[PDB]
Design an enzyme around this catalytic site. Structure first.
Site, PDB file in Angstrom:
ATOM      1  N   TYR A  26      11.332 -17.923  -4.631  1.00 49.00           N
ATOM      2  CA  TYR A  26      12.308 -17.575  -5.646  1.00 49.00           C
ATOM      3  C   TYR A  26      12.206 -16.100  -6.031  1.00 49.00           C
ATOM      4  CZ  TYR A  26      13.317 -22.576  -6.262  1.00 49.00           C
ATOM      5  OH  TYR A  26      13.757 -23.874  -6.106  1.00 49.00           O
ATOM      6  N   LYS A 208      19.066 -36.552  -8.896  1.00 53.29           N
ATOM      7  CA  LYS A 208      19.559 -36.204  -7.562  1.00 53.29           C
ATOM      8  C   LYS A 208      18.449 -36.168  -6.515  1.00 53.29           C
ATOM      9  CE  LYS A 208      21.107 -32.034  -6.225  1.00 53.29           C
ATOM     10  NZ  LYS A 208      21.867 -30.824  -6.645  1.00 53.29           N
ATOM     11  N   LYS A 210      17.277 -35.440  -2.336  1.00 48.69           N
ATOM     12  CA  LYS A 210      17.625 -34.681  -1.147  1.00 48.69           C
ATOM     13  C   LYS A 210      17.684 -35.716  -0.018  1.00 48.69           C
ATOM     14  CE  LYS A 210      17.501 -30.458  -2.863  1.00 48.69           C
ATOM     15  NZ  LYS A 210      18.768 -29.648  -2.961  1.00 48.69           N
ATOM     16  N   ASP A 238      21.935 -34.756  -2.242  1.00 47.22           N
ATOM     17  CA  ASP A 238      22.304 -33.420  -1.769  1.00 47.22           C
ATOM     18  C   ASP A 238      21.911 -33.310  -0.290  1.00 47.22           C
ATOM     19  OD1 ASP A 238      22.589 -30.645  -1.311  1.00 47.22           O
ATOM     20  OD2 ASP A 238      22.086 -30.198  -3.405  1.00 47.22           O
ATOM     21  N   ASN A 240      22.535 -30.537   1.520  1.00 46.97           N
ATOM     22  CA  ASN A 240      22.366 -29.124   1.789  1.00 46.97           C
ATOM     23  C   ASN A 240      23.042 -28.551   3.048  1.00 46.97           C
ATOM     24  OD1 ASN A 240      20.559 -27.783  -0.380  1.00 46.97           O
ATOM     25  ND2 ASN A 240      19.560 -29.764  -0.014  1.00 46.97           N
ATOM     26  N   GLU A 264      26.363 -33.895  -2.400  1.00 49.51           N
ATOM     27  CA  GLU A 264      26.522 -32.450  -2.511  1.00 49.51           C
ATOM     28  C   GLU A 264      26.405 -31.776  -1.149  1.00 49.51           C
ATOM     29  OE1 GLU A 264      24.541 -30.581  -5.926  1.00 49.51           O
ATOM     30  OE2 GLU A 264      23.765 -28.945  -4.665  1.00 49.51           O
ATOM     31  N   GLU A 291      27.849 -24.441  -4.883  1.00 48.29           N
ATOM     32  CA  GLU A 291      26.816 -23.445  -5.150  1.00 48.29           C
ATOM     33  C   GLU A 291      26.861 -22.242  -4.222  1.00 48.29           C
ATOM     34  OE1 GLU A 291      23.698 -26.434  -4.522  1.00 48.29           O
ATOM     35  OE2 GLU A 291      22.691 -24.964  -3.241  1.00 48.29           O
ATOM     36  N   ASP A 314      28.321 -21.660  -9.704  1.00 47.27           N
ATOM     37  CA  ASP A 314      27.081 -20.905  -9.752  1.00 47.27           C
ATOM     38  C   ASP A 314      27.288 -19.576 -10.456  1.00 47.27           C
ATOM     39  OD1 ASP A 314      24.993 -18.834  -8.385  1.00 47.27           O
ATOM     40  OD2 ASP A 314      24.174 -20.870  -8.408  1.00 47.27           O
ATOM     41  N   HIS A 341      25.455 -25.729 -10.844  1.00 43.63           N
ATOM     42  CA  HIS A 341      24.259 -25.649 -10.024  1.00 43.63           C
ATOM     43  C   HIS A 341      23.348 -24.736 -10.842  1.00 43.63           C
ATOM     44  CE1 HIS A 341      21.627 -24.451  -6.644  1.00 43.63           C
ATOM     45  NE2 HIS A 341      21.788 -23.216  -7.084  1.00 43.63           N
ATOM     46  N   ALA A 342      22.044 -24.976 -10.775  1.00 44.97           N
ATOM     47  CA  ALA A 342      21.076 -24.152 -11.497  1.00 44.97           C
ATOM     48  C   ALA A 342      19.739 -24.154 -10.765  1.00 44.97           C
ATOM     49  CB  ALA A 342      20.902 -24.665 -12.915  1.00 44.97           C
ATOM     50  N   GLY A 343      18.661 -23.889 -11.494  1.00 43.88           N
ATOM     51  CA  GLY A 343      17.348 -23.872 -10.868  1.00 43.88           C
ATOM     52  C   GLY A 343      17.009 -22.469 -10.416  1.00 43.88           C
ATOM     53  N   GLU A 372      22.829 -28.836 -14.195  1.00 46.26           N
ATOM     54  CA  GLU A 372      21.617 -29.101 -13.445  1.00 46.26           C
ATOM     55  C   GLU A 372      20.423 -28.431 -14.106  1.00 46.26           C
ATOM     56  OE1 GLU A 372      21.399 -27.368  -9.418  1.00 46.26           O
ATOM     57  OE2 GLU A 372      20.430 -29.259  -8.814  1.00 46.26           O
TER      58      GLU A 372
HETATM   59 MG   LIG Z   1      21.890 -27.635  -3.444  1.00 43.88          MG
END
Ligand SMILES: [Mg+2]
Length: 425
Positions: A26, A208, A210, A238, A240, A264, A291, A314, A341-343, A372
């Protein structure tokens, strides 16, 4: 005369990888709009990156300095729509996009910083600054080009005006009840069921998981979770962007029995026709994406083709607040919910204002959706998000909640950060 004297940028990255994107670090291309007024008067913004390339993303932002330094603060603040277009309409910058990728996100960061700036000046948290602007002031900030076939400024004004009366009420409701949230923290397999139960116990009404690597696993994990969650908790999945159209359809039909709130990004974030085809093939399983959606023009098409049941939004992926407002208006006009969308780094801190502004000044609907939430790096922000029993508490401090602790930047700047200096040793 208050003026913007500098545009400072920092390449900030956290070694989160040491805790379709494996091992992501990140990061944030941190931007600060400095002025010659109270040291309190500055605009903060950032582009969320995932590791490599954060340096190029930072350079893109730094390249916008000449466009901003020397500008009158009051002139920026009074015409945010014009300020955004001064960057958005630079034909030479457009060539690097246009309105997509690195260059556009860099622009979005500076634009967001400008809104943070205006909010601080108005001494209001961004969500309130936005929701309290007149329908006319809101519309002036949005770029209607390429949207006249789906959302004219008159249509945008109509929506904002019909919502103006309840703005006072919705504001109180929000400040009292907060905004619904959902977690992805448990979905990154005894842990699945455990974390799922804790999530419900913590108040989250939506979860949610994955999926996308193995059908068998997905079928099992979705079953275990549905039963470990009860039949009244919403559970999303999700993928991805993993699948092609055909495989996505075959895959999702095997997960339908576990009651999917929505899938998603089942395929490429550029495939509008593909998402629509997937949606048609797996009905009634809801489909979403957003996102990574480049700009309001691709969103317009998603809505036009009926490729989505709901949409992500986003804060740093597009052209700043100006563009997200347009997207929020598009979504409202077409009647499709938006689950932000967040995080990542500060995405929660940022996107919460947009969702809250939407509730107050445009839709008046929040119990049918959610923002999120992911519990990461919130301690590096002066105004970290606050989750109270599965809900976002409305921020109160002035701004976009983007400001980060100097010590954090000092510790994680790359590659000269106190941490990065020692690490590469
Ligand atoms: Mg995602």
């Amino acid at each position: 005369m208050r003026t913007i004297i500098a545009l400072e940028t920092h390449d900030v990255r956290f070694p989160t990888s040491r805790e379709m994107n494996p091992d992501p670090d990140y990061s944030a291309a941190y931007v600060v709009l400095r002025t010659d007024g109270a040291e309190d008067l500055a605009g903060y913004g950032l582009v969320f990156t995932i590791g490599r390339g954060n340096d190029v993303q930072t350079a893109a932002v730094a390249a916008l300095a000449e466009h901003v330094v020397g500008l009158s603060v009051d002139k920026v603040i009074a015409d945010l729509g014009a300020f955004a277009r001064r960057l958005t309409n630079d034909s030479q910058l457009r060539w690097l996009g246009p309105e997509k990728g690195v260059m556009h996100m860099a622009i979005g960061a500076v634009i967001n910083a400008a809104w943070d700036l205006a909010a601080r000046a108005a001494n209001k948290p961004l969500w309130r600054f936005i929701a309290e602007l007149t329908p006319e002031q809101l519309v002036d900030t949005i770029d209607f080009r390429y949207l006249s076939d789906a959302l004219t400024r008159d249509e945008a004004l109509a929506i904002l005006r019909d919502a103006q009366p309840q703005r006072a009420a919705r504001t109180a409701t929000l400040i009292e009840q907060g905004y619904p949230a959902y977690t992805t923290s448990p979905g990154w397999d005894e842990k699945l069921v455990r974390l799922a139960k804790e999530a419900v116990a913590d108040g989250f009404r939506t979860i949610k998981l994955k999926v996308g690597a193995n059908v068998q696993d997905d079928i099992r994990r979705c079953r275990l979770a549905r039963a470990a969650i009860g039949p009244d908790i919403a559970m999303a999945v999700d993928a991805n962007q993993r699948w092609d159209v055909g495989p996505a359809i075959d895959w999702m039909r095997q997960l339908a029995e576990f009651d999917i709130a929505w899938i998603e990004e089942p395929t490429s974030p550029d495939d509008v026709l593909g998402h629509a085809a997937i949606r048609q093939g797996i009905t009634p399983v809801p489909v979403s994406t957003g996102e990574h959606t480049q700009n309001r023009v691709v969103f317009k098409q998603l809505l036009q083709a009926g490729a989505v049941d709901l949409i992500q939004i986003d804060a740093a992926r597009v052209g700043g607040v100006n563009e997200n407002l347009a997207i929020l208006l598009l979504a409202a006009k077409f009647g499709v919910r938006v689950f932000p969308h967040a995080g990542g780094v500060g995405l929660c801190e940022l996107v919460q204002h947009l969702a809250m502004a939407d509730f107050v000044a445009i839709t008046g609907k929040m119990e049918d959706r959610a923002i999120e939430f992911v519990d990461h790096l919130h301690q590096h922000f002066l105004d970290p998000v606050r989750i109270q029993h599965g809900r976002y508490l409305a921020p109160e401090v002035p701004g976009f909640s983007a400001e980060m602790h100097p010590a954090s930047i000092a510790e994680f700047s790359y590659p000269d950060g106190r941490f990065w200096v020692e690490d590469l040793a």
